[PDB]
Write a protein that binds this ligand. Sequence first.
Ligand code: NA
Lengths: 212, 212, 210
Amino acid sequence: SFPLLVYTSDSKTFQQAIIDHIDRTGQTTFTFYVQGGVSGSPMSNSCRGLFMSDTPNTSSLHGVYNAIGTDGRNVTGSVVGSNWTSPKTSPSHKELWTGAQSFLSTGTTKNLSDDISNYSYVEVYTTHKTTEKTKGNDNTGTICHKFYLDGSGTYVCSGTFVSGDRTDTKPPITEFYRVGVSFKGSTWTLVDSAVQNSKTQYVTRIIGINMP
Amino acid sequence: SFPLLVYTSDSKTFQQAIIDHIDRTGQTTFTFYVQGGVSGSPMSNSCRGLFMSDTPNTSSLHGVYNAIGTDGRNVTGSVVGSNWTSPKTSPSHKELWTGAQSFLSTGTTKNLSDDISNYSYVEVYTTHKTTEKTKGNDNTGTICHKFYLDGSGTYVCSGTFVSGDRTDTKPPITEFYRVGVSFKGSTWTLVDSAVQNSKTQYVTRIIGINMP
Amino acid sequence: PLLVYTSDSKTFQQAIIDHIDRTGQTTFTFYVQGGVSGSPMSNSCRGLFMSDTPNTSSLHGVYNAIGTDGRNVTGSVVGSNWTSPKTSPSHKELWTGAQSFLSTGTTKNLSDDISNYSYVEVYTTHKTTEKTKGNDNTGTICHKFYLDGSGTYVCSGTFVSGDRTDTKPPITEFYRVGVSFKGSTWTLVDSAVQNSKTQYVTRIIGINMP
Ligand code: NA
């Protein structure tokens, strides 16, 4: 078979290209190539994809499409009685590092499983023990700090915890924490930290994120 | 290739429709339409998509599907023997604004690239300079604040930073920050803020999010 | 039509190249067994490859694959530069409602077992101590966790509020709510509120990032 090919030099929207293909061929399910720059395309860069429908009625078209771009981004969309919905772009991720680096291990570098330049955002996870126990537990779970990668020398994960069981004599206590990290190529470094108690705090996971 | 059509009126689950279809037709790769409200459908709204199996053996079915909603929501799923996995529903996003609005620019309105009513969640990104430098630098990177859009007049991005290098006698210092933002149609406003140094802090990105 | 097994001792990328070279097919479906070097995912998958031409020494193409657990990966090759595979996340809303921070020791149901997720987003909805420019609302704030087996997932933060005057700076407050999960349930375990206004947990979304 012959997938639908849509060029900018055709001077035809994506939507009219799909209509014309279905008029000409009667196909309801088929693949397609759309050159980057085609008006109404699921995306800006070139893409390929799959159009799915069951009735080739181009006056009231009902169908969906699933397209992938040159950077791997996934875009899905629909047409409902010949009205085209806004294409939906998915995010993606890759787990780059997991382990347990004490906040006290400043100036230490570890590897990422891919280069940080393949990501626009990142999630850095930290795992804490609060100054005091609250209902017998000082553990916090593992907390996400999400950043946009803006070229900073330091990505700063800084926050606070309340902990302790209130008595009439002693309210809960408050504490501040920080860990700063940096990225370079396929590596990351724990640059700085501040801890307000004697317990060990860790960086435990780094996840690369794309939101194309 | 015959399409599978599944209506609520059929009193048949999505999974049984699939089984029945492959038993009736012998076809192991086909497209489908599943009316909104069908039991065990990949999503609650109406969808269309592709089922792909290894063989027409419905007693040990091995296969995948992609289903896309009337609003372009994307779901993938699988079958292993008589065990259907839960549907994996994808999120989507759109960048609505990027720039660099100072926290001190309260009352100022800027444009979004899409109407906020098209999103259920939103990420607001802020970019800071802490009061003191830490290991040679006061930048924080660009920090995400994610909200569910609940109709509030103000979405509040408020946190703390630790900054400065500890000496033998002087600890790091702490600061608080706040920026509050609002959304209306295809616009946003920087409503209020609190900064505790003379350095400039910015709102830099707004990303609309759907988690259908 | 393309089947790749760990026993073939070839990478996903070389298997695609071989398939195109052998058959001249540029669009085809595939099965890749869990463990194949360079596969879009670590578990077994099935999907669709689409390429521009059969020039395998400068391949331009894309793929969409689905794993045995339903995970979805998409990717591309541009002039035989294979770009990092783009793994989608997934989610399920597990609970929505309005549970006061003061309702400690209370349990509610989730729509699915927490063991089916690796991450969770817990949403909290606040009223700050003071009104700021006429309003003490915060919106509904996400706290995302990796589910590490902790007995408490601690949502804790601060708010500045109040209108600055000559006399009276803005005020600061700390808050905390701790939650736990067991099977298809969650419990509001502990809290700290520094005013008399009602604070809520409002949403719990289960998240997978395979
Ligand atoms: Na996706």
